[PDB]
Design a protein around this nucleic acid. Structure first.
Lengths: 129, 129, 129, 129, 129, 129
RNA sequence: AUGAGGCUCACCCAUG
RNA sequence: AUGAGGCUCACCCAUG
RNA sequence: UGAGGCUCACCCA
RNA sequence: UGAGGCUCACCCA
């Protein structure tokens, strides 16, 4: 058993799919990275800690890079023109059962489901209106 | 046109579906709340601001309550035994096109897709392993 | 292979069996918990360390809870009336072969076998006499 | 009901079985040892005390010898190279009933049952993976 | 794509082959060891980390036992007289692509190929001359 | 004999093969470089030292460059965009015979053999999972 | 000596 | 390191 | 704690 | 900035 495995971060059908694979798990911080130049890679990190007596707290991070080539003095390197940073923290009381978590997850999936307000706004450089 | 509308936060097929509807949009902070007692309601807030010169930054929040009845002196009130707090911040450079955002969104949808590491861990009071 | 799998902690003839599963491997400490709220779960943790230049030390910890339903602030919460803690440390020389280690496991199995002195005293709230 | 009697520590199905028998009872600390020189014997000690006002605590200790290349009766130094030490401490709240204690024994039996992670990792000089 | 599997460390054409298999994964440091007491086993550990902002670094460690006059299972001291230690550190800039990395692996394969200086000097207790 | 000879560092089916040759033995450090400008050359260095009273230590270093053509001061110069560094130290007891040393070489050859875990992770920019 | 310490890589650091 | 030291249990204490 | 900031497991009030 | 905390658009280093 193990969930620290390779998975599809971006789904482009079956071709162009961005896959992220395990890379390091030091200090309680699991890290996934896509293939090729670390400089142009997608990155996902996750960790859980007992934030307070009654709370456990997940801290997840995602990085989406803008793949580009940097030329300098005629020396071209694979870099990331820029990066987009996702950064969430989920807090769950110790009284939550597996059923309660399953709900908390369905909530997060719904929040971003296609067509709903928030993901629709983000995908259009827009806000709410 | 408008995206500040009612939407399904939790999808339980077609029955038990948690729907959240607009409630207030003051100070650039859009807010959605489920029906019935505000005390046991789901809550979603979202806002966008120009964080720096080159960055725009979304700040999204979700609250999942544990619906319960509080009895005191024989007076029972609808309350929330506890609450789970989602709290994300997404940063996107001003050079991102609509195509780049569409990707950033597909990344977030994949992160939480059923069966993948992170949502699977959360739904089981577990961490990575 | 991979030995980080779920297993039956308390065997009750396939009915009322407390089965524990992998839940976290952060910081080199493997963890298993039962399908309960993290506040009423059985918990087993294991970890191996090269304690000395010529030794290895396994540290195993097991928590058995007495589940209950406390009514705090006039609200019902799943909780543990009390917990029983098992803490064991096994130190094995590096010179011990596999057939030497198999011998240690067998000793620990026979120690707690039904009907033998120790598990007999424990289960009857008495000492050895 | 005297439960201080000899028992089988290592069971090899009749042939090659290791029997441990009463050898000392000084200070309420019962001791069982095999029929060997004390430097190569299997030893088991066990005692109970009221650790604190809320708990009771069993302290069980097992010493198992390294047999591969052992020289029966001979002098083998350094001693730490030829012995593995087990060290258990079971804490049980004063509210635990006989039935509660039986469950705590079952939990310990299951922990070490054949084919489960822990006893499998140990018997192979491995950790969890 | 799980690449953490058993493999052949010492190949003697089928007969007398030394297989090393997964034995630990604590702290993201994967460990492989042969079927021996830990004092005489072949051991392999490997990990990756972002050494600096510009680099990534693999730290591979191999422990190989002295076999001539070895006493299988026995206690052999001093330990430093019966073990050879390998210690590799591969630094790879973040700009290196998969293809670049393949070439770096080929470079390492060639370094140690049969009949080349280095592996020839080592296998004969010699230096370069 | 004399083992200080040239050899193939990177094998590309006799075409595009990076062959390295002896270039310096000053200060007890044998050196090999490729037929390039000293600024874009592959470099391999080896040296043996009687580190301890009972040990010998081989220190091997390999540099793999990413050749490029920088335009400094408006002039074209052959240079290295970046370098990848391999640094290995092998410590072998003086008691190790030739057949013991041959065993070490074979272990290091199998470690990097195509298809095995480590060279597989390295060539795909990932860790072991 | 030891470090899953660091480098622009036969150098630097920490510890002991 | 060692403790038939302690806990609300991957923490605290004592000694050395 | 923050609709505090970042070159993102860092920094700030 | 933080794998800083919360009763969650607040507070902290």
């Amino acid at each position: 058993a193990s969930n620290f495995t390779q998975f599809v971060l971006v789904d482009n059908g079956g071709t162009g799919d961005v896959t992220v694979a395990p890379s390091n798990f030091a200090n309680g911080v699991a890290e996934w990275i896509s293939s090729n130049s670390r400089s142009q890679a997608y990155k996902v990190t996750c960790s859980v800690r007992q934030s307070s007596a009654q709370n456990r707290k997940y801290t997840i991070k995602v990085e989406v890079p803008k793949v580009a080539t940097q030329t300098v003095g005629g020396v071209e390197l694979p870099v990331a023109a820029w990066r987009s940073y996702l950064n969430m923290e989920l807090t769950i009381p110790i009284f939550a059962t597996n059923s309660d978590c399953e709900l908390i997850v369905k909530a997060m999936q719904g929040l971003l489901k296609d067509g709903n307000p928030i993901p629709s706004a983000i995908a259009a450089n827009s806000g709410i209106y």
